[PDB]
Structure 1
Amino acid sequence: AVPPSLRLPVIEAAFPRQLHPYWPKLQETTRTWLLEKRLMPADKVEEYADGLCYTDLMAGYYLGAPDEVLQAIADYSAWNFVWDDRHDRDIVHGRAGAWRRLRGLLHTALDSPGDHLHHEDTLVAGFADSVRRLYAFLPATWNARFARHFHTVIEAYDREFHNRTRGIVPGVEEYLELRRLTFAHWIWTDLLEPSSGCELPDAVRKHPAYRRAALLSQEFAAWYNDLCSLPKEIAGDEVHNLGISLITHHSLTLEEAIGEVRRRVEECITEFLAVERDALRFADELADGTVRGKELSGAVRANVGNMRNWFSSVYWFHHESGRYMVDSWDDRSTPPYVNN
C-alpha cells in the first residue's frame, strides 16, 4: 500500500513488475560478497543487507541477463550504495582529505582494476573487483565507454561534496544537469548492453528514439528517488534533490514541491510511452533479414524492454527498501545501515 503522495497508478497498472529467475541466488551471493569484501560490518549485513533490496532492484531491471552478468551488476550496484553512504559520511564529518584520496583512488582503479583487487581501502578493492568482472563481458570499446562515463560520475560526486560542505543548494536546471551524473544515468544505460550480450554500434545506440527512451527511463528513476528519498535526505542535511532546489530557488513550499516533482515524474512515464513505440519500430527495422540484423534487433528490443522494467523496479524498490524508512530510526540523521 503506497502512500498517496508517492502513488503512481499508471505504474501499478501498465508496468507489471518483473523478476529475474536467478534472484534468490543473487540475493545470497551479493550478501556474501559484501561480507567477504568487508564493505559493510558483519552485524549490519546480517541485520540489514536483504532488507535493503539492492539485489531485488537489479533483478527487476536487467531481465534476460546471464547470471554472472547479473552478479557482476548487483555487486557493483550494491558497492555504489555503500559508496553513497561513505561519501555522505565524509561530508558529515568533513573528511576532505579522506574524500579526495578516495576520489583519486577511484579514478585510478577504474582504468586499472586488476591492480587494486587487494588495495588496503576495502571500498576501493570492492570497486576494483566488480569493475574487473564487468570488463570481462564485452570488447575494450565498451569498457572504455563505461570508464569514460564513470569518470564523470566520480566528479559529479565531487561537486556534491563541494556543495554540501559549503551549503550551496544548486539551481533547478543546474540540479537537472548534476543529477543525470550523480544517479549514473549512463552507467545503467551501458550495462543494458552486456545484459543482452551485445555492444551496440554508436549508430544504433545514439538513434534519437533509443537515446530518448534511455534518457526518459533514467529521469523517472532519479526523480522518483528524490521524491521518495526526500524525507531521509532532509533529515540528513542533503541539498541534492529536485524537491530541495525547488523549495530553495522557486519558493515553493513542501507540498508544492512534492506536487511539481510528481507531475514531472508522470510526464516521464507518458513521454516514455510515446517514444517507446518509436524505439520498438526501430528494433523492428534493424531486422533486415541478416544474422547481424536479427542480433541488433533482438538486443535493442531487450534493452528497451529493460528500460521499461526500470520504471517498475525503481517504483517498488522505494517502498520495499529499508534504506528510506527514516520514520523507523532512533536517529533520523544517521541511518542504521551506515558506518558512522
Structure 2
Amino acid sequence: FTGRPLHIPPLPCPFPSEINEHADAVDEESHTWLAASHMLKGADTVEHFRRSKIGTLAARTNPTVPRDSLRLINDWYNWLFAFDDAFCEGELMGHRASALARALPPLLEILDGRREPDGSDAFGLALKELLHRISDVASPAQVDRWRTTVKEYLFAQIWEAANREVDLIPTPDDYVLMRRITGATYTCFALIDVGGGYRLEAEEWHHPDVRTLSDLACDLIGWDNDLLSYAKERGNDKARHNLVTVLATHKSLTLQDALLEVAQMHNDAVAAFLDRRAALDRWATLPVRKYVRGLEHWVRGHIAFSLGSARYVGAWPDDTRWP
C-alpha cells in the first residue's frame, strides 16, 4: 500500500449482534480438529488460523444452536477457510481452470458418499467425516440441500481460476452473480435449521420471499467480506475477486470511491432486505421466522467478526481510518 490513508466506510446493520455461549470451548476444539487434519501443511498457516478465531465467526453467526451443532458448523467453517486458502486460491490449482475442474470429481464422489478418501487426501477425509456428522442430525432432503450448495460452491471455484488464468477482473454483473456461490455462504445457510434442530418444509425453503431474503443476506455477506478482506487480498493475485477491485476497474474509480460504492450497495441491500422481510412477516411460519432471524444473526455476526479478526485487520495500513 502507498498513498494517503484510506477511510473504511461503516457497514450499518440494524440486526441483533449475538454470540453462542459455547464460543471459547468450541473454537478451541474445532481449531484442534483443523490442526490435526493436515488440511493446512504450514505451521504459519495453522497459527494464522488459531489467531483468526474461526469459532468466533461460528458462534456469532449461529448464536442459538446447542454445543454439538456449534462444533459441527465450526468444523465446516474451518474446512471452508482451509480449502479457500490451501486449494482454491493456492498457486498450484487456483490459476488453471482445467486443472481445478479435473481435480473436483474425486471430492464430488466423496460428497455423494460413493468413494473412500485416500489416506493422503486431507480435504476428502474431513469432508467424508462432516457429511456423516451432518447426515446423523439431518433428513435426506436437508443433506441433499447442503450437498447441492457445496457442489455449486466447488464449481464456482473453476470460474475464479478461469479469471486468474486469463488475467481478467470479472465484470460487475458476472461478479455479483458468481460471488453468491464463490464464498460458500449458502452452504452455511443450509445448516441453520439443521443446527437449530428444526426442518423447513420444501414449500417454506423454496418460497420466493425466503429465497429473496437468503439471496440479499448472501449479497451482504459477500460484499461485507470484499470490503474488509480487500487489504489481505491485495497481497494475493491483486484482489481480483473483490467488489472493490471489480467496481474500481469497470467504473474507473479511485480505491476510496470504490470502497464507498461497496458501502452504498450494502446500504441498498439492507433496505431491500427490510422491505421484503415486512412482506414475509405477514405469512411467516415459526420455522421460517427462526431461519430469517438466523440470516439476520449471520449478517450482523459476520460484520462483528470481520472488523476484529486477525484474518483481515493485519493487512490494513496503520493509518487506515476504521469506522
Taking structure 1 as the reference length, the TM-score comes to 0.83
2:9 to 6, 27, 31: 6
- Alignment-derived partner of residue 75 in structure 1: 75
Map of 2:255 onto structure 1: 254
Q: Distance in 1 between matches of 2:207 and 2:7?
A: 37
Q: Which residue in 2 is equivalent to 1:265?
A: 266
Q: How far apart in 2 are the matches of 1:160 and 1:275?
A: 31
| TM-score normalised to structure 2 length | 0.87
Task: Tell me whether 1:301 sits opposite 2:289 in the alignment.
Answer: yes
Distance 1:318 1:6, change over 3 A: farther
> Which amino acid in 2 is paired with 1:88?
E
Shift of 1:186: 2.2
Bigger relative contact order (CA 8 A; separation at least 6): 2
Asked whether the equivalents of residues 31 and 78 of structure 2 are also in contact (C-alpha less than 8 Å), the reply is: no
2:214 is the alignment partner of 1:211: no
Q: Rate the CA distance shift 1:82–1:138 in 2: closer, same or farther, 3 A.
A: same
Aligned amino acid, residue 123 of structure 1: F
The letter for the 1-side match of 2:81 is: F
Gaps of 5+ in 1: 287-296, 330-340
Contact 2:217–2:273 (Cα < 8 Å) also in 1: yes
Q: Residues 91-118 of structure 1: CA distance to partner in whole angstroms, max 9, x if unpaired?
A: 58857786455422221211117723x5
Q: Deviations over 1:226-283 (max 9, x none)?
A: 1111122122113111111212222122122111111001112222222223333323
Q: 1:227 to 1:122 in 2, by over 3 A?
A: same
The corresponding residue for 2:320 is: none
Say yes or no: does 1:107 pair with 2:95.
no
Query: Take 1:267 and 1:97, find their aligned partners in 2: how far apart are those partners?
Result: 37
Relative distance call for 1:257 and 1:215 in structure 2 (3 A) is: same
- Percent same amino acid among aligned pairs? 25
Aligned match of 2:128: 128
Structure 2 equivalent of residue 291 of structure 1 = none
Give how far 1:19 is off: 0.9
Maintained 8 Å contact 2:183/2:222: yes
Which string of whole-angstrom CA distances, capped at 9 and with x for unpartnered residues, describes residues 154-209 of structure 1?
A: 11001111111221211100001111110224212211120222221221122232
| 1:63 pairs with 2:63 | yes
Contact residue 119 and residue 125 of structure 2 kept, 8 A? yes
- Residue 77 of structure 1 and its aligned partner are, at CA, apart by 1.0
Give the superposed CA RMSD.
2.4
Per-residue CA deviations over 1:120-174 (Å, capped at 9, x if unaligned) read: 1212212222222122211112211221221111110011111112212111000
Q: Map of 1:1-340 to 2, 5 A cutoff? A: 5-8=8-11, 10-11=12-13, 14-41=14-41, 43-44=43-44, 47-86=47-86, 87-90=88-91, 99-100=100-101, 102-112=103-113, 115-116=116-117, 119-237=119-237, 238-283=239-284, 286=285, 297=286, 299-327=287-315
State how far apart, in whole Å, the 2-side matches of 1:230 and 1:303 are: 29
SS for the counterpart of 1:90 is coil
8 A contact 1:16–1:312 mirrored in 2: yes
**Which has the higher mean CA deviation after the structures are superposed, 149-158 or 232-241?**
232-241
